[PDB]
Design a protein around this ligand. Structure first.
Ligand SMILES: *CCCCCCOCCOCCNC(=O)c1ccc(C(=O)O)c(-c2c3ccc(=[N+](C)C)cc-3oc3cc(N(C)C)ccc23)c1
Ligand SMILES: [Cl-]
Length: 292
């Protein structure tokens, strides 16, 4: 499994800030837009892109506050990410896209697609944001720790002051051990404790047991859109999962129109880090089939 990130940095000014993005592959045709989540960056896609890039343009931004993108003194609410991602997509002139999305990047991508349904030609997704109706549907092993994260004093202490989302949660979201290079590359954006705001606001945004009500609503709205859309869909899932347990993956593979579902083997949240070969191969192949 490659630890390298052999992509030249590109930057675009967005709302007066700058965002970093990978942009590889051919200049024409429909681009594939890869959206990471918490607490990753475009780095999470490094072993998936090289399988897609021979045939398609691959664009992988770092969310505002993350990666190599700028770090303005925001609250990094989901609304903030929405604003910056809408503006990134316009600043690059993108017209139609294929979306490849994960964790909070999935809330972004689905919320975009709902609002711009004529510009979305396919969606591949994995470990994605859906409403978690009660805390019982959060996995038991991570339950206590996510509940602590969703406080101000204790959660900030953990995420911001002790860097637990990077040091603890991130390796607990991958079945294989991450290597020290890997860990250092995920550490890099968050060396300064003050830059850890998004790492804490994210889990506080998770739509769990009805809260926060605004996020619950928005997520329900794009899940309804999704259930009704004929757009081609590709769902990766793993066992036991985190956000998407196998039973849920099986239900969505039948409930969503035009949905192909692919089991990656063992997986928790960062499926890309457990089976990037399968994921990149199956995306490249599926992309071919969107023309058939
Ligand atoms: C969009 C959703 C994203 C989900 C992201 C990944 O998924 C969630 C899986 O949740 C795990 C939640 N639990 C913890 O973060 C946690 C609990 C207990 C302990 C612990 O060590 O007591 C840690 C922990 C570590 C666990 C594993 C680990 N590995 C596999 C190398 C390393 C750990 O290191 C630390 C370090 C600290 N510090 C104070 C620095 C604290 C806890 C751990 C995590
Ligand atoms: Cl999160």
């Amino acid at each position: 499994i490659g630890t390298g990130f052999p992509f030249d940095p590109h930057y675009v000014e967005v709302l007066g800030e700058r965002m970093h993005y990978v942009d590889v592959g051919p200049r024409d045709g429909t681009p594939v837009l890869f959206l990471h989540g918490n607490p990753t960056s475009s780095y999470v896609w490094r072993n998936i892109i090289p399988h897609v890039a021979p045939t398609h343009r691959c664009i992988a931004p770092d969310l505002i506050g993350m990666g190599k993108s700028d770090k303005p003194d925001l609250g990094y609410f989901f609304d903030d990410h929405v604003r910056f991602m809408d503006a990134f997509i316009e600043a690059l002139g993108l017209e139609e896209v294929v979306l490849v999305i994960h964790d909070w990047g999935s809330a972004l991508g689905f919320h975009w697609a709902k609002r711009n349904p004529e510009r979305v030609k396919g969606i591949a997704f994995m470990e994605f944001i859906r409403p978690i109706p009660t805390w019982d549907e959060w996995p038991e092993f991570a339950r206590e720790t996510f509940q602590a994260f969703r406080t101000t004093d204790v959660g900030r202490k953990l995420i911001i002051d002790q860097n637990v989302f990077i040091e603890g949660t991130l390796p607990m979201g991958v079945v294989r051990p991450l290597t020290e290079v890997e860990m250092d590359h995920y550490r890099e954006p968050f060396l300064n404790p003050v830059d850890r705001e998004p790492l804490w606001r994210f889990p506080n945004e998770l739509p769990i047991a009805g809260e926060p009500a605004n996020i619950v609503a928005l997520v329900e709205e794009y899940m309804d859109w999704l259930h009704q859309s004929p757009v081609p869909k590709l769902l990766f899932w793993g066992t036991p999962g985190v956000l998407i347990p196998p039973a849920e993956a099986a239900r969505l593979a039948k409930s969503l129109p035009n949905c192909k579902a692919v089991d990656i083997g063992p997986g928790l949240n960062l499926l890309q880090e457990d089976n990037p070969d399968l994921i990149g191969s199956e995306i490249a192949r599926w992309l071919s089939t969107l023309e058939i």
